[PDB]
Design a protein around this ligand. Sequence first.
Ligand code: CAA
Ligand code: CAA
Ligand code: NAD
Ligand code: NAD
Lengths: 291, 291
Amino acid sequence: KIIVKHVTVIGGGLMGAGIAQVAAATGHTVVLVDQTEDILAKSKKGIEESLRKVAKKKFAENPKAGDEFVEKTLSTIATSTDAASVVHSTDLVVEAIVENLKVKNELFKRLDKFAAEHTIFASNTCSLQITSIANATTRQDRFAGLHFFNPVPVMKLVEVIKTPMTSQKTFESLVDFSKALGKHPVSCKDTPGFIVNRLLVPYLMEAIRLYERGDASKEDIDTAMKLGAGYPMGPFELLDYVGLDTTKFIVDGWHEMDAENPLHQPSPSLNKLVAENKFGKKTGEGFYKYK
Amino acid sequence: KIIVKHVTVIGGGLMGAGIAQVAAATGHTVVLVDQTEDILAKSKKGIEESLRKVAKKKFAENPKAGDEFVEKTLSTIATSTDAASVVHSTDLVVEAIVENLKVKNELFKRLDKFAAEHTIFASNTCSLQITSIANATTRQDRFAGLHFFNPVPVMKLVEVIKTPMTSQKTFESLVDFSKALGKHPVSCKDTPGFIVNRLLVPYLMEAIRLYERGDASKEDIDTAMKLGAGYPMGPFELLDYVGLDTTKFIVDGWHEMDAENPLHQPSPSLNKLVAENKFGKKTGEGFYKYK
Ligand SMILES: CC(=O)CC(=O)SCCNC(=O)CCNC(=O)[C@H](O)C(C)(C)COP(=O)(O)OP(=O)(O)OC[C@H]1O[C@@H](n2cnc3c(N)ncnc32)[C@H](O)[C@@H]1OP(=O)(O)O
Ligand SMILES: CC(=O)CC(=O)SCCNC(=O)CCNC(=O)[C@H](O)C(C)(C)COP(=O)(O)OP(=O)(O)OC[C@H]1O[C@@H](n2cnc3c(N)ncnc32)[C@H](O)[C@@H]1OP(=O)(O)O
Ligand SMILES: NC(=O)c1ccc[n+]([C@@H]2O[C@H](COP(=O)([O-])OP(=O)(O)OC[C@H]3O[C@@H](n4cnc5c(N)ncnc54)[C@H](O)[C@@H]3O)[C@@H](O)[C@H]2O)c1
Ligand SMILES: NC(=O)c1ccc[n+]([C@@H]2O[C@H](COP(=O)([O-])OP(=O)(O)OC[C@H]3O[C@@H](n4cnc5c(N)ncnc54)[C@H](O)[C@@H]3O)[C@@H](O)[C@H]2O)c1
């Protein structure tokens, strides 16, 4: 049973950056990997802002301690554009790239050849099947899902997904790691969307359909869900927060799998926004515009 | 335009009691109505208890102010077992009885005969069509939906639903009343479930279906939604909190309306609990067991 200490995070986007931030803030040595040096600089810069906020609040009285905290956490995050070399010796690979089965499979099939034998592979996928991605490698006993929640520095949940091939030792290492991160792991079966997404995503699509039906405005729906059901964000605010591209990819995947299911019927409005590269907060504009 | 001062709340259950409490607390003369003196007594006791908890927080540093608030509010709430004896001199009727169309129509048809000419009729229905209930009377211009959220003393949202026949005068009186109650009114179309329910209830059913599938436990599903989506309550805690009998009625109505729609397929587990008279917190046991 390995103890996760050196963590390789593939993808420095919304989730990848957050995962790297929390892992580094909790004493793990992290290596954040992405496609270009510019994307990585943007990711690390973003992680700094997220930590800076904490510092200015959590260390109001002790400013120097705050800076030290921010600097030390950032220093614990290395960057690279060559995953293959980085995984040679790493305890865990947490993949957080585009929600696309083929792309993830190709990624893991390749890394499986460069990673040390003890290395554990984990996918932060929202809707794909872990068993499917695991079989893209010959390391199934060391493969499982480790699903975090947006934004990683705040959301306490982490869904741990075993495939029937995942070993108890691998499972345990991931559970321990989740806790070391200060998170609350919940073991889930390898079913589409696991728990949260399986219930959240269809709800967000119903929200869009209500709007498309012409029954209410996005503003009123968001206001209603927040003031009537006590939700932190209305569905449209949340969609933009999460990313319209990721949501669309998720629903398209389920749609292909069960085309006759009306619950996975894609949305024209959603498709139009994604087609115009308006992914929400990521790009500065989604259902709503952001400065 | 009439300014609502006297309100007759019919039904002293979860919502009725809450509506009567807030109205009285905000300076309206209230008459709470229910089937028996005993039921009314229990309702009044619950309201008093609710008021004291409010006093503890709102008047923590002034016990006397707290006592006066509790006393004044309770003395503003009169009771009667027959609303017909009250409506001839009331400004607004807010109905909050069992979620059943036939029963609601029977009630309004009768009150229509006793109510004063200017009296506005409002239904707090969750899933029925306001137009249908309105046509049970010949006062459609003074009929509309006024939908509050559980618990009324806390939830700020209030969906105001006018029908094609609702007069502007009636609508504005209800918007003004909502604000007088310190609420945030949102005008909604007369469509099934209006805004919130149309989106929330199908989600709650999916939570149940996921559980019945054996994919996960109610406890983990609740934990996941609270920690992953930041919801105040897990779906099962909310279900018991809202009332399983009410939820079942809501869905049965929509199901009869569109039998093939996967959104409204009845739950065997939900039907069984209701059949065994386990409606949730209000009965001491629903999906979970309470004191
Ligand atoms: C998409 C999928 O398939 C999978 C999934 O992940 S589903 C999406 C799951 N996530 C959600 O549902 C998001 C729902 N929204 C929320 O829970 C909340 O709105 C939120 C966590 C985003 C925070 O919103 P908020 O309450 O308004 O806080 P905000 O006003 O934004 O910031 C203030 C607080 O939040 C924290 N915060 C917010 N974002 C932060 C970040 N990225 N890093 C560090 N702290 C942050 C601050 O530390 C601050 O703490 P204090 O209250 O002590 O001062
Ligand atoms: C079916 C339909 O058609 C329409 C509907 O109603 S759908 C369902 C809508 N309602 C929801 O979804 C409920 C979601 N849940 C919630 O928002 C919250 O859990 C809640 C409002 C029920 C309160 O939960 P909570 O935060 O844990 O409060 P609780 O711990 O229960 O009590 C403490 C606080 O809540 C308040 N409170 C809770 N119940 C109360 C009541 N019945 N009366 C007065 N105050 C109450 C207190 O004022 C108190 O204030 P402080 O924070 O300052 O101490
Ligand atoms: N957005 C959310 O709220 C949320 C929450 C949990 C899980 N997820 C899941 O996590 C994954 C990450 O989504 P995200 O929001 O961070 O998206 P994102 O688009 O913000 O970030 C993805 C990052 O992956 C990089 N990338 C793509 N292919 C790569 C490759 N081969 N090697 C290295 N980097 C590569 C991109 O350059 C980008 O920076 C998806 O599978 C999604 O379903 C998203
Ligand atoms: N439970 C919720 O969270 C929620 C929220 C908003 C609206 N509603 C809606 O409000 C209504 C009230 O539901 P509730 O939760 O208060 O239920 P409840 O079962 O807690 O209370 C209903 C009350 O109605 C009384 N009643 C029944 N038939 C009556 C009649 N013919 N005449 C007079 N009184 C009668 C009962 O004696 C009971 O006290 C329903 O239409 C429901 O859909 C419920």
